[PDB]
Design a protein around this nucleic acid. Structure first.
Lengths: 138, 167, 205, 37
RNA sequence: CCGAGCGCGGGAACAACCGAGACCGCCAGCUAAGGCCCCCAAGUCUGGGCUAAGUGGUAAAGGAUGUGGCGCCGCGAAGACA
RNA sequence: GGGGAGGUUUGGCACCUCGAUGUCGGCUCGUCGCAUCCUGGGGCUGAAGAAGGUCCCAAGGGUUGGGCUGUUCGCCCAUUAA
RNA sequence: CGGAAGGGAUAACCGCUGAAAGCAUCUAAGCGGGAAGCCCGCCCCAAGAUGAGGCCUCCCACGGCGUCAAGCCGGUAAGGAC
């Protein structure tokens, strides 16, 4: 025949908990959904994978000594511009970040790979913009 | 635990007594339950961390129980020349081996008690929070100084040379 | 956390008590207490402050003659004092009291593209034994064949002057509300006709 | 003795009840304080 | 083995380290090494030991009541270790 | 007497550079490293206090002017909290 | 005029209460002290911060083909440009 290519399907939204969850393991699941790998008709160059609103990311669990160990880094083009922040301080001040960082790196790098990052809203709450559907998951 | 009233909430073991009530939160890896009259604890197994945590925890509760059965007795026997004290109202004042006066003042749970300049006493109802203060006043004025001069638990000087010890 | 706007002039030397002292003269004037900004619909507390009245036909329009009370703007539009909130009346000059150190915002007067040993102050050198050319040249910038990448912010020859800055520690003994003036220790940046604004000190605040 | 790779059991009061992950050698006269650094 | 197999995968990348001789087209399947939580394609497979430091994520002499297993001579209800 | 980091010196090897990458210090602009000289810290002493001896912690900032030598190496003065 | 004054976490280091290991302990749970050092409190840039933030307003709709779905199209509004 000739492999089938999906029409302009309607993006399905989804809601996920967070608290008590494992960071990596959580995102691990998020990503495969930001894309159509969960859907039967996944297609590479398209972007049709569910949007994902995650609640209270402010209470995600992390193993080992991460809490004190794990250090995120940012580099301003400036000399000695290396800035490294510990997972411990990332929670305190704007923690919804940790989950994002964790996922972004777990998605393609190309144009749409950031396009799908946009499909993910994370809130240090819970609580979201109750836009529509949003069937909670497990 | 005669006239004392113990109780266990989630992981934290609340202990109320005629003195008052203190919070004694210790790990849920055993069997904290008040029964018969005295609380008991049963380690999950003979495994390392479990042995340790067991001994520790059982002692923590066993202590903090007496923490409201009056565990105040601790004081300091300050030695030295210009070492004086006078607890005005609520504030413990002293001008020991230091220039300016000093104001040591009450924290929650424990209480001071000056009998006189040279041997201050402390009614501290919290065996953990008390000894803190103990070694903290003692750290306020570290004694020894080769010979004497300073504040002592029941502490004994450790000898060395005065206008000597200098080859 | 108090404050009021100002405009720049003069810097003399009047002799208080005995000693002789340099004195900046700014006109603080009547400044429209036009409305506050609130932490719900903003995120913090802030007050818009106008200034010296001339604005007629030229400025008009939404005016904020709207705002809530009108009053018409100065000629020096308006700014804001952060974490600030007086009473509700259009305040003036003597909002402060003589003999106090405080802080000031000012537009450093422009100068344009200028020298390397002038902007930052390098050293240059070569008068007679060196070369005629490289009098005012930065000499050197980078490395050899590693890392070899020119650094961002390599302190370069360019514009200096037309900037803006706050400043700490300024003792004001003098003030003439009877004409709306404020005379302080003397250091204020800017031309005699530019932006200045007095905020409160931070020696231990 | 402080900071040297031999944290034995010097003066027979000195102990190794390992703390912080770097054995100290704890005594009385503290000219006897070997360390792991 | 390359060179003349800088043709094909792995190995992050990597002439010669492992697989494997490319006539050509297919939108089929066994398989090689490597390999499966996710890049990136296939086991958050099943079963069991150990580890609690990022060891994993590149070093030694040597050191240490680290933590678990295997064992040898005592002391023990005659009463021990503290 | 063994073991080792460090890749700064001084030896060895000779591949991109023989269709060029111009070697000594100084001018001048820095800049990365800590095994840190001043400054903070505490440990300790064959430490009275005054200074010192020593080991870990810690780049935040700082670390001079000259005489002679082409001279980095160097000696010398006048100094520095160094 | 400025480096700072101050809040919080930490260094080695000192201590509290305490187990395994009936004794001990600054330690594996919990508390506390701890540095110019880390983070803010300081000063400029800064929403190309493609999240393109938000406030205070301002003017306001059809005026000509698309009825439906988006285009488009001349002069006006608050304004703005020369």
């Amino acid at each position: 025949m000739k492999t089938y290519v999906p029409k302009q399907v309607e993006p399905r939204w989804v809601l996920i908990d967070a608290e008590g969850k494992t960071l990596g393991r959580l995102a691990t699941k998020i990503a495969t959904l930001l894309r159509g790998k969960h859907r039967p008709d996944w297609t590479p160059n398209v972007a049709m994978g569910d949007f994902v609103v995650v609640v209270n990311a402010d209470k995600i669990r992390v193993t080992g000594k991460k809490l004190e160990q794990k250090i995120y880094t940012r580099y301003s083009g400036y000399p000695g511009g290396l800035k490294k922040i510990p997972l411990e301080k990332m929670l305190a001040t704007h923690p919804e970040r940790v989950l994002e960082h964790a996922v972004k790196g777990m998605l393609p790098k190309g144009p749409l790979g950031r396009r799908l990052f946009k499909r993910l809203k994370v809130y240090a709450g819970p609580d979201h913009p109750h836009q529509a559907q949003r069937p909670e998951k497990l | 635990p005669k006239g004392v009233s113990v109780e266990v909430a989630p992981g934290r073991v609340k202990v109320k007594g005629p003195k008052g009530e203190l919070e004694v939160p210790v790990s849920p890896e055993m069997r904290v339950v008040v029964e018969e009259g005295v609380v008991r604890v049963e380690r999950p197994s003979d495994e390392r961390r479990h042995k340790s945590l067991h001994g520790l925890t059982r002692t923590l509760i066993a202590n903090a129980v007496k923490g409201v059965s009056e565990g105040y007795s601790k004081e300091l026997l300050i030695k030295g020349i210009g070492y004086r004290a006078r607890l005005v109202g609520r504030a413990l004042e002293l001008t020991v081996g230091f220039s300016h006066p000093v104001v040591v003042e009450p924290p929650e749970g424990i209480t001071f008690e000056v009998p006189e300049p040279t041997r201050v006493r402390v009614s501290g109802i919290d065996k953990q929070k008390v000894g803190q203060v103990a070694a903290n006043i003692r750290a306020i004025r570290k004694p020894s100084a080769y010979h004497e001069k300073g504040i002592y638990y029941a502490g004994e000087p450790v000898r060395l040379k005065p206008g000597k010890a200098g080859a | 956390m108090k404050g009021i706007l100002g405009v720049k002039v003069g810097m003399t030397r009047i002799f208080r008590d005995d000693r002789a002292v340099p004195v900046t003269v700014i006109l603080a004037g009547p400044c429209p207490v036009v409305q506050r900004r609130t932490p719900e619909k903003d995120g913090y507390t802030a007050v818009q402050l106008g200034f010296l009245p001339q604005n007629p036909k030229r400025v008009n329009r939404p005016l904020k003659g709207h705002f809530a009370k009108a009053g018409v703007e100065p000629v020096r539009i308006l700014r804001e004092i952060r974490d600030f909130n007086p009473e509700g009346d259009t305040v003036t000059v003597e909002i402060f009291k003589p003999g106090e150190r405080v802080d000031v915002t000012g537009t450093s007067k422009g100068r344009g593209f200028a020298g390397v040993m002038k902007r930052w102050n390098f050293a240059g050198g070569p008068d007679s034994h060196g070369a005629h050319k490289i009098h005012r040249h930065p000499g050197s910038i980078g490395n050899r064949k590693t890392p070899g990448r020119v650094y961002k912010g390599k302190k370069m020859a360019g514009h200096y002057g037309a900037e803006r800055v706050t400043v700490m520690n300024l003792e004001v003994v003098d003030v003439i509300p009877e004409e709306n003036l404020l005379l302080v220790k003397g250091a204020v940046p800017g031309p005699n006709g530019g932006l200045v604004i007095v905020r409160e000190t931070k020696k231990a605040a | 003795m402080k900071v040297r790779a031999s944290v034995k059991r010097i003066c027979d009061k000195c102990k190794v009840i390992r703390r912080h992950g770097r054995v100290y050698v704890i005594c009385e006269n503290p000219k006897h304080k070997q360390r792991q650094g």
